[PDB]
Design a protein around this ligand. Structure first.
Ligand SMILES: Cc1cc2nc3c(=O)[nH]c(=O)nc-3n(C[C@H](O)[C@H](O)[C@H](O)COP(=O)(O)OP(=O)(O)OC[C@H]3O[C@@H](n4cnc5c(N)ncnc54)[C@H](O)[C@@H]3O)c2cc1C
Ligand SMILES: Cc1cc2nc3c(=O)[nH]c(=O)nc-3n(C[C@H](O)[C@H](O)[C@H](O)COP(=O)(O)OP(=O)(O)OC[C@H]3O[C@@H](n4cnc5c(N)ncnc54)[C@H](O)[C@@H]3O)c2cc1C
Lengths: 566, 566
């Protein structure tokens, strides 16, 4: 066997890598130990960035037609049981009109609810169609690196055979216990994730629309520990989660209690368990090996950043491998994979963990014990209806506590979108870092400075709305400018013919292909109309010029050659 | 390797077979020579029967959320070009209110538009998830049958290795040039399909909603030969088809002419060719080999019966192999596969071909030549606007001709649903064949007589509509009766414990789990309320009793033992 890139793993990171590589004409052989694509629903939250990437390749429309949309996952209800009395609700997943606006202004896509069970196979099938060899029931065993590529040993669970595959690079998208990471010797840190804890999940079917329809929500939390009624399909498919474990028909009981009532005909599906040693990789790259996904970041499910962050890891490295394999870019370009993705890995492991320190306070608000029994939790409901000044501080305390839990339920827009890149793959412009005017975890800050992702705004084509993001991507470099920067079209030519690289230029303005109809691009560019913003295949701005002056024009070439390593 | 059933092919028939077998707990290893699932859109029409089967397994909702629905494929427009003048339209795919009612009354599902490109992978991924081993890039080379199973030789296009797989049965779902059919020696007939002719298909993208939206249609025919603008995704994705061929950028020209105007920005995709030696197999079964799909029926694309008929071939044989492999049924049960599916194979090859003799008359109506040039076809448009009595006969002639083309565009409801089974797997009741009151190709006739598929009617559960079909299926035998046939619950028990077979009984009536709310079941059963209708896992009624009399009750056992071959 001989492939350009061996992809170990077919989950979110692997499938995406194979689809993008194929889309770029690079031969890749993605493997996966199991029969199917994952069985449980696992991850479910799809953030804007993941959507954008789905939109770039043409998989958004299908994605949206298998997901629950944003309007059905805004009611986060804290209660005793589903059929019980509530404590309160929070506007989850940017439901609050303010949060919704900030959401809508940051990108043309929007939160949706798509379980991994359906997302996986959509991407695996597309990778194959796009020309990426796929092969399940084949496990990676190890590899040996050498100066011209790698050879790896594969076990085939169908024939029982064993074989080698020669590849130029390997992508370690093999999960939480990456054998690829262990072989490459990648250092891991921040294991302080407390005491290694797991979760137990149970699937079951019931028709609980009568207790959902009027208050449509992605999840219904129960205080019972902090159990959780997560919707899989509205409102007939479910799952309970709570905090390596055996259970039986008794689970049906647990649920009947989690539903409060035992009258909706329930059908108990599979029962899994999930453990996690919270850690990141300090480095994601060793020689010709690159890891990504849970293979570089392992953490809690708070904020659902794991599947999203993993697809973004694949987006950042695909075009890069493709440019290097085609000889248009020097192998150095690959060094920025670690530079740009590694800080994202550590950032999310810590944030996902920090969010776990927001729930506990809801208990302390009900002046309760973590191991509340019944009377205790029934006496809390009483103390809460108290008509005294001390009942007010109390109710106020509980509202405060619950509202503090939003950062882990749709409130961390900054965390999802505020990616700042520093590396050879980004050509600095000379300006200083502007900062964040407001909290960088909670609110997103749009920025055209090199290192940041393009900012969304709407534009028009045939008088129909198109987003700045639609103009770019496509496995190519993008240059955006206006009418007065006409000179950018030629520069770009001279710098593309000479560098053997594709470089699409768009001159936005009146009577042009794309038009600044609402004047919003002029508003969000942070530069004259004659300036230019170079956009990488992954949507990040690496180069920014303030005008079309000879000294601004001459710099393009220096930036591209620099970004490519030549 | 060792599997219970080797499935050669992963298209519609193979994927479905693997999903159903898995669903029945039978170990199956489905293979496929290619990388992906098919690339072109190929088949696109999904008939009611295919839907029903999707609904039984739980894949209807997903299917419906990737398809164009019935309301967008009712306007069949005959024109010069898309942007030209029309000759006329026909109500395709049961759009006509009368046809729509007959459609809606025959089943709880409805025509939809889902290309094979999306349908394939939905079913392949589900088969894997359900526990069916899948493996592409593996080709079948041949096999040797022996009295206890078969051994087949496989070529692996990934490792280059060659290996054997031992299986009890093989399912030849390998297409139009089935190597499995040739090895099993299956006789083929009715090659008279005239002179072997092909079609050329071309994909392209344009935004032609401005010339579709007001007249939503599955296809736009152009008279140019009989070209055809088929929609893939409304209304940006397309394909032209017309009557082994090379073409280039010039195709873009062909289309610009097929669109009439050259102003919509067009993007030329792939260009394939499709050939077909019209033939059926006289027998579909040899020893331990069973063929299905195009491997048993090859024909034109008129009436889109091929993909539907192929899924139905898999539905008919899955439960059967499962009962035999579990030792609950004698190997003889498998003999009815040929008895019941074989006549369907010949019926559709001939019908698909006959439909090709309905188009030609539209020309003779315009008093034209098959090879019309331009002036000729422009002079036809003139002769058509003539204000004479001879212009009237003419316009009337053309309307007649076009309306005759409906049998191949949604008019053959009988053909899609009028399956009559005769075999050991059906226990006759003693009544004679009732016939069809109206044309058996055009209109469907519901019939509770053994050998026919359950008739759809609505019933209620929790006051919510459920279709008689929903009560049955599930890889099990189903007995339907009413309040006065209470005795059927016990009989069924005695006959299920003793035969080691699952047999669900439903007593439909007032205050029961299912209720004849609209009295429609009482109306369509053709028997007393005390009677019973036994339904096979494939939705076909094999046994029918007129009442709960001791002589009617005692017969159940004799029928089940007979249907199973014991
Ligand atoms: C049970 C469970 C429940 C979860 N629930 C949630 C949730 O509710 N919310 C949330 O945000 N996140 C959840 N996660 C985490 C989430 O699944 C990850 O963030 C996401 O799957 C990362 O994608 P990945 O492809 O990197 O991981 P994976 O998809 O696990 O990548 C590894 C894949 O490669 C294959 N593979 C592994 N080892 C080998 C080998 N040696 N050889 C060949 N192939 C191999 C495996 O088939 C595996 O599918 C859950 C994880 C698990 C396990
Ligand atoms: C180009 C094209 C266009 C078409 N367009 C239409 C249309 O517009 N309308 C319509 O109604 N019908 C159309 N058809 C016919 C339609 O595709 C068939 O009715 C349908 O595909 C039947 O399903 P199947 O799985 O039996 O066929 P297939 O899916 O072809 O079954 C064979 C499959 O098994 C695999 N296989 C084959 N040989 C081997 C081997 N030796 N070893 C291992 N694996 C093997 C192949 O990968 C192949 O996918 C078209 C067919 C083609 C080829």
């Amino acid at each position: 066997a001989e492939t350009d890139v061996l992809i170990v793993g077919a989950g979110p990171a692997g499938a995406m890598s194979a689809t993008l590589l194929a889309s770029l004409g690079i031969r890749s052989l993605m493997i996966n130990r199991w029969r199917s694509t994952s069985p449980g629903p696992r991850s479910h939250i799809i953030n804007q960035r993941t959507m954008e990437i789905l939109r770039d390749i043409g998989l958004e429309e299908s994605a949206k037609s298998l997901a629950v949309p944003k309007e059905y996952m805004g009611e986060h209800v804290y209660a005793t049981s589903l059929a019980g009395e509530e404590f309160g609700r929070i506007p989850a997943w940017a439901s609050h009109p303010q949060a919704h606006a900030e959401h809508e202004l940051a990108s043309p896509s929007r939160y949706c609810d798509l379980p991994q069970l359906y997302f996986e196979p959509m991407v695996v099938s597309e990778a194959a169609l796009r020309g990426a060899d796929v092969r399940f029931l084949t496990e990676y065993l190890g590899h040996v690196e050498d100066q011209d590529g790698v050879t790896a040993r594969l076990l085939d669970h169908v024939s029982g055979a064993e074989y080698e595959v020669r590849a130029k690079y390997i992508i370690g998208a093999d999960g939480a216990h990456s054998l690829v990471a262990q072989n490459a010797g990648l250092p891991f840190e921040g294991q302080m994730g407390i005491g290694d804890s797991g979760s137990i999940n149970i699937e079951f079917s019931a028709d609980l629309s009568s207790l959902c329809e009027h208050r449509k929500g992605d999840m219904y939390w129960m205080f019972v520990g902090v159990a959780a009624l997560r919707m899989i399909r509205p409102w007939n498919k479910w799952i309970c989660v709570w905090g390596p474990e055996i259970t039986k028909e008794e689970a049906k009981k647990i649920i009947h209690e989690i539903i409060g009532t035992d009258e909706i005909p329930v059908e108990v599906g599979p029962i899994s368990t999930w453990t996690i040693n919270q850690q990141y990789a300090v480095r994601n790259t060793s020689g010709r090996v690159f890891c990504m996904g849970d293979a570089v970041h392992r953490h809690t499910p708070a904020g659902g950043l794991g599947l999203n962050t993993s697809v973004q890891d694949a987006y950042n490295l695909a075009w890069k491998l493709a440019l290097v394999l085609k000889g248009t870019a020097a192998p150095t370009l690959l060094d920025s994979y670690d530079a740009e993705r590694s800080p994202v890995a550590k950032q999310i492991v810590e944030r996902a963990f920090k969010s776990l320190s927001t729930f506990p306070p809801v208990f302390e608000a009900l002046s309760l014990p973590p191991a509340p029994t019944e009377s205790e939790m029934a006496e809390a409901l009483v103390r809460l209806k108290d008509a005294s000044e001390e009942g007010a501080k109390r109710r106020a305390a509980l509202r405060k506590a619950m509202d503090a839990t939003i950062i882990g339920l749709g409130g961390g827009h900054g965390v999802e979108l505020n990616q700042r890149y520093v590396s050879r793959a980004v050509f600095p412009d000379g300006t200083p870092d502007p900062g964040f005017v407001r909290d960088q975890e909670f609110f997103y800050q749009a920025s055209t400075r090199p290192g940041a992702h393009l900012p969304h705004v709407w534009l028009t084509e045939n008088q129909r709305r198109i987003s700045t993001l639609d103009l770019c991507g496509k496995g190519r470099f993008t240059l955006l400018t206006g009418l007065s920067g006409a000179a950018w079209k030629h520069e770009a030519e001279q710098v593309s013919q000479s560098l053997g690289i594709e470089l699409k230029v768009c001159v936005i303005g009146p009577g042009q292909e794309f038009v600044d109809t609402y004047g919003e691009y002029a508003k969000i560019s942070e530069i004259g109309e004659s300036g230019a913003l170079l956009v990488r295949p992954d949507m990040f701005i690496a180069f920014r010029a303030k005008d079309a002056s000879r000294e601004g024009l001459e710099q393009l070439n220096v930036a591209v050659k620099s970004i490519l390593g030549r």
